[PDB]
Design a protein around this ligand. Structure first.
Ligand SMILES: Oc1cc(O)cc(/C=C/c2ccc(O)c(O)c2)c1
Ligand SMILES: Oc1cc(O)cc(/C=C/c2ccc(O)c(O)c2)c1
Ligand SMILES: [Fe+2]
Ligand SMILES: [Fe+2]
Lengths: 497, 497
């Protein structure tokens, strides 16, 4: 077999990116300031964190075993529980005590035949009394919210119609449905998209098979009252390239950014309209809604070049690290229009941003608050001379959060400091009567001075001020998505406004 | 109640001394070099590590909750498991989410009434299929060697005759007995010493009650074929002082270092002879044995002033940090002699040393190898300018190990490096046929550059060279004692030479 290294090497596992690989508990975390005593619930987040050194050199960040963190809050106290998802990959590699899975989404490079290749490392959501650890090439892995035990691959009582389940399902706060899809829904290189939904009782509602114009990456999607919307990143899969040991994904400069629109209920596959936005990268969706005219307002991060620059085009053409900025874009779509080309979007702010969150009590409806990561290159905001030698590589960087009020246009910015960077934030309603966007924001910080992680708690009344700073004595490696599960919400999701 | 701080403050919990307080697992530790594939077994060590900030300012290191590390070795791979001893203190404080136990060994300062005050934080030994987590003011806590679950307070099937069990029992490699004692054996301030032993079947053998000349600290003891030996540190307990909120221990410059000698079998309490060594501090015993004449050779660390300087004399007189050195001393005792005063000891080496280990296959018999911690103030060995600002306080420092060959007088020194310090080492026989002192040495390092811990593996053929360096991504706080449990030893202890 290819030799198994016995320690981590390469920039993607250097400095703050070095895997820790701890599972267990740290109770009664140290707190500076004061956690609001009324906060009660759990912040779950997932990070890629390779359990064993890869036999693939410079294995991408996206290919690391999913490790789940839970921060359990009650009466101003907080405990951490941490556990790896017991994926097939995790278990078989742990048994062998060496890496067996090869390149990102390329089964032809695996040292053994896997049934499920999930690292379950992208998102961690709450559904009907379980956590679902998500990875868009795979079904979810179900886990216990209290103990973080892995139950196993989850197929929704045999109802799951797709081989794949998106990392970005949407929770309709009015219908209490989970709205889902999978792309490459029939396997590697397939153009099949399966759109499906589950009612609050767990029974499958929608199931619509449609066909993508290209086998492109559909990382995120959007849901409105009457439509679902599929933006396609111009990364394209060719299985013949994979069989020769090549990358699953390859940028294509010659195609638009397709945006499919399908009626949300009762549709057939042929009802989808593939609108064509200007070539660019479809980033995370903040939210989408239908306005007064019945037009879809789609608000999402959008860049003009390949954010995933390590997967360039066929001639190796693509940007360099730190070059591509994504901006908070508004696209307007009309399902009735027969014109496929879309205009350039309008932009809501100037900041280089990503990882937008809204008050999920208005998801699929008009929202007027968005919280998001920013990366400000203005001199002084980040001490790059100090941070970059300690940072390693392979992961995006955020040096603040921003809160946009869409009505007033006011923006507040939280800057943790010149030697700290942030992950994706969560929003917590102050209580069940709170106005939209009124409550608390939490965000995990990487402190490059201490080489430790911290969890900041902010009040939306003044995002610039930390109300509490929870000081972890270990590093939590840069992660991906996370969610709040409030103790007052029986089904884990907040009540509609 | 006295206010409970919500983060750690003071030098004793600063820098590398900051509690991490993690429990759980890190499998497949990163390894630089190569762990000898024949090594099979577990290195257990214990560290004081406060689970909650104390309400006592500058609480001594010795008063922190015992946290057990196990390093499980097989076929050149190693896993870490880590778990707190579930003492009464740990459990009740965890329930309350605040500190309740007060000053070191002073129940009159506790906020609630404890039955058992153990932090179980001094030593962790193997006996008849269990770990025993030790603290000299208490009975042992029994634990599972595989899972580190705490079973509870252990009383040897109701046979334990004493309130107290030493942190330094000795294992006779020929008789397979565990030889024990407790001081303050009938409660705070008592001069009662209970000497007792257990046969390999778990039945109590010896039980002899004797009386100390003063209520002094007997931290360690020594066992020969025919004698047991009790060196008394001139720290003295007055329960009336304690009732007023004072310290359990107070130095007394006016007394000798008593060394009691009792026949090992069949004795009465009045058979003890209290020899009087020159005033000084009784450090750890390497080993004791009877020579050809039947004289006891007692080899132990010995200092001329109070190593525990934070417990000074009645007028607050004593040394400052880093001032007192201890030296590897040989005392000669003759049980038949009626002369009580002893001569100054001879010294085996000149190094400032402590934490001596021998090949325990010759414990209680003549040994000719000792491994020990050293602290070398020779310029450059430790980069103090770099280390001391990162180190915190409250714990002793070791910047190397030494191996003394007692036949030849040869000394090898292992120096981990200018920005690393060491804990107490363990010795592992190469195999069951290995000569005395031939095999492997392991020692945990504090790396102040990375602010991480490492576990070094050395071959005794060349102690200056690391064969493997196991790289932990977390800190293990400076700890106390540890032990090797070899997989090839049915009762957990090595066979006699
Ligand atoms: O900074 C960004 C911006 C973005 O728009 C998306 C991502 C992550 C996407 C992702 C996609 C597939 C994976 O398997 C995976 O681990 C991660 C990260
Ligand atoms: O550096 C040294 C030298 C020494 O000779 C003894 C000790 C530790 C003694 C000790 C005594 C009682 C306790 O409760 C405890 O945690 C530790 C530490
Ligand atoms: Fe995402
Ligand atoms: Fe000791």
């Amino acid at each position: 077999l290819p030799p198994a290294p016995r320690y981590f090497q390469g920039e993607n596992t250097a400095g703050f990116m070095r895997p820790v690989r701890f599972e267990g508990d740290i109770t009664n975390l140290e707190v500076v300031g004061e956690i609001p005593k009324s906060i009660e619930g759990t912040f779950y987040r997932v990070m890629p964190e390779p359990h064993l050194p890869s036999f693939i050199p410079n294995d991408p960040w996206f290919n690391g075993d999913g490790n789940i963190s839970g921060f359990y809050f009650k009466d101003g106290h907080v405990d951490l529980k941490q556990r790896y998802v017991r994926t097939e990959k995790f278990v078989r590699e742990a048994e062998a005590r060496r890496s067996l899975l090869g390149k990102y989404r390329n089964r032809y490079t695996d040292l053994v035949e896997f049934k499920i290749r999930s690292t379950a490392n992208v998102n961690i959501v709450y559904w009907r009394g379980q956590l679902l650890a998500l990875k868009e090439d795979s079904p979810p892995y179900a886990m216990d919210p209290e103990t973080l035990e892995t139950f196993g691959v989850y197929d929704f009582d045999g109802q799951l119609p797709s081989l794949t389940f998106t990392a970005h399902p949407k929770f309709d706060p009015v219908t209490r449905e989970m709205v889902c899809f999978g792309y490459e829904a029939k396997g590697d290189g397939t153009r099949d998209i399966c759109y499906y939904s589950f009612g609050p009782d767990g029974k499958i509602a929608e199931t619509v098979w449609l066909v993508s114009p290209v086998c492109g990456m559909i990382h995120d999607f959007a849901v409105t009252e009457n439509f679902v919307i599929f933006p396609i990143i111009p990364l394209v899969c060719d299985v013949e390239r994979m069989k020769q040991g090549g990358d699953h994904w390859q940028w294509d400069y010659s195609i638009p950014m397709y945006i499919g629109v399908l009626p949300r209920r009762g549709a057939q596959g042929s009802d989808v309209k593939w609108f064509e936005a200007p070539h660019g990268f479809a980033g995370h969706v903040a939210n989408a809604f239908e306005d007064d005219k019945g037009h879809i307002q789609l608000q999402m991060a959008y860049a003009k070049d390949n954010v995933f620059f390590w997967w360039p085009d066929a001639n190796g053409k693509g940007p360099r690290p730190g070059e591509v900025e994504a901006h908070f874009a508004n696209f307007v779509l009309d399902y009735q229009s027969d014109k496929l080309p879309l205009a350039e979007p309008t932009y809501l702010v100037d900041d280089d941003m990503e990882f937008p969150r809204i008050d999920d009590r208005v998801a699929t409806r008009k929202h007027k608050h968005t919280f998001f990561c920013i990366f400000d290159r203005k001199p002084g905001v980040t001490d790059f001379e100090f941070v970059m030698p300690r940072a390693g590589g392979g992961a995006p960087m955020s040096n603040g959060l921003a809160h946009l009020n869409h009505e007033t246009g006011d923006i507040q910015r939280y800057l943790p400091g010149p030697r700290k960077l942030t992950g994706e934030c969560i929003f917590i309603p102050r209580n069940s009567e709170a106005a939209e966007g009124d409550g608390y924001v939490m965000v995990l910080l990487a402190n490059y001075e201490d080489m430790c992680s911290e969890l900041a708690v902010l009040d939306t009344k003044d995002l610039t001020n930390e109300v509490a700073l929870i000081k972890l004595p270990v590093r939590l490696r840069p992660g991906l998505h996370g969610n709040w599960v409030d103790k007052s919400d029986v089904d884990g999701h907040p009540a509609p406004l």
